[PDB]
């Protein structure tokens, strides 16, 4: 045993390299509230990862003639004026690989579960283009939620996007976590064509709630194939804006390798708030509801990467279950409607129905799955062909 413990450190020490390279530096000339302006860095790329002294990473979003406005992805408390900022020479990217299964990771991929480092296979940039119209195939494989209402009325297929939208305490997280747990039987087959890997992205959730979700997954045996990208409330707006993209990248790595993924985003509404915070701190002029003009391009850029790849690209998939918290049962708000128009179907969980006894509280009338029968087995397609319209009537 001791041989391996000695050998790991010995190999690290031997591999240690004294190589030096012409790194280029800038200087922070302004900092506070998660945003730092860095004078210098003439060759910094847009959305490049900048390295601040305390191992703190930021992303260069604004590139003016004077300064580079960067969002600090981490603890900005130690970012003083005059500190050196080195450019990573790498566009915004996160590590990806099979090592991320059963782990809880920051939006930057570095683990926060307290276990060891994650042996990433490679690094994937968060802003690779989504599969084009010619790189996809129709969503035909069912993703069994295990909930009769969803699988019968608004079926979720492998590769399509089902927005779970509702007010507080309606059952959105319950539905998503049940979906994740229901994939254990498929996972145990050992067949990549049936295994469904999961990435539960938590945004602006108190750490104990993420712990509750992780405990539920563990007791259900789901952490064996589930990753949690946790951007808990405490972390600055940068992590809460980056977490869906980190989860989407981790899922996309598997997707492009011929494996099926299931991404949950609890809550895309908290991502929009974080992006609003970053933009207002960068002093972008806001649009409606004080949100940045391109919040739609945020949620679309995220969700449109969930796709069923064609056979020429390995035939993988990524199923997205974004979660949206509507204030006061108003599905006609701005962000809710944006996400509805971006997604392939919606499950509207209404508090009134939840109290009436309808658990989970799917408002059959508003809910819909545009894949429909294509995301159901023939048996359920036959016995439940018109169930949703019948219930709405």
């Amino acid at each position: 045993s001791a041989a391996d413990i000695e050998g790991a450190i010995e190999d690290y020490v031997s591999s240690f390299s004294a190589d030096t390279e012409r790194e280029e530096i800038g200087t922070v000339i302004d900092a506070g509230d998660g945003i730092a302006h860095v004078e210098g860095l003439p060759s910094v790329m847009t959305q490049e990862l900048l390295e601040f002294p305390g191992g703190v990473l930021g992303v260069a979003l604004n590139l003016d003639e004077h300064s580079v406005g960067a969002v600090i992805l981490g603890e900005f408390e130690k970012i003083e004026e005059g500190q050196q900022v080195k450019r990573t020479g790498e566009v915004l990217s996160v590590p990806v690989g099979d090592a991320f299964l059963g782990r809880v990771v920051n939006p930057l991929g570095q683990p926060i579960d307290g276990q060891g480092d994650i042996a990433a296979e490679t690094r994937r940039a968060l802003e690779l283009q989504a599969p084009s119209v010619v790189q996809r195939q129709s969503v035909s494989e069912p993703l069994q939620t295990g909930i009769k209402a969803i699988d019968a009325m608004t079926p979720i297929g492998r590769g399509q996007r089902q927005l779970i939208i509702g007010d507080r305490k309606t059952g959105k997280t319950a539905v998503c976590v049940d979906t994740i747990l229901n994939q254990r039987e498929a996972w145990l087959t050992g067949d990549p064509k049936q295994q469904v890997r999961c990435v539960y992205v938590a945004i602006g959730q108190k750490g104990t709630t993420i712990a509750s979700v992780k405990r539920a997954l563990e007791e259900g045996g789901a952490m064996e194939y589930t990753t949690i990208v946790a951007a808990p409330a405490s972390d600055a707006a940068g992590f809460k804006w980056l977490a869906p993209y980190t989860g989407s990248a981790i899922g996309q790595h598997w997707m492009y390798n011929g494996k099926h993924v299931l991404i949950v985003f609890d809550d895309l509404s908290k991502q929009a708030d974080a992006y609003r915070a970053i933009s207002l701190l960068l002093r972008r002029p806001p649009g409606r509801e004080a949100f940045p003009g391109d919040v739609f391009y945020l949620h679309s850029r995220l969700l449109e990467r969930c796709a069923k790849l064609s056979d020429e690209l390995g035939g993988g998939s990524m199923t997205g279950l974004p979660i949206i918290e509507t204030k006061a049962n108003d599905i006609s708000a701005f962000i809710p409607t944006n996400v509805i128009s971006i997604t392939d179907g919606q499950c509207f969980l209404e508090s009134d129905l939840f109290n009436q006894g309808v658990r989970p509280a799917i408002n059959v009338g508003v809910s819909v799955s545009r894949v429909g029968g294509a995301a159901q087995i023939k048996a359920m397609k036959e016995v439940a062909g018109s169930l949703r319209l019948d219930l709405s009537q």
Binding site: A2, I5, E6, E10, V13, F16
Partner: protein, 50 residues
């Protein structure tokens, strides 16, 4: 369920004991390993052996 939980708890306790003893032994070995590890690390940092 209760029987399996009790058996699992007993197995965890037995591991926490025996594995802790194993870790103590491995730590004793690592204590001797530290000198060579640090020497080689310093040699790499400086360069030119030493």
């Amino acid at each position: 369920r209760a029987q399996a939980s009790g058996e699992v708890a007993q197995t965890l306790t037995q591991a926490d004991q025996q594995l802790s003893a194993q870790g103590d032994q491995v730590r004793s070995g690592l204590e001797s390993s530290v000198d060579g590890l640090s020497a080689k690390l310093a040699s790499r940092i400086l360069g030119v052996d030493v």
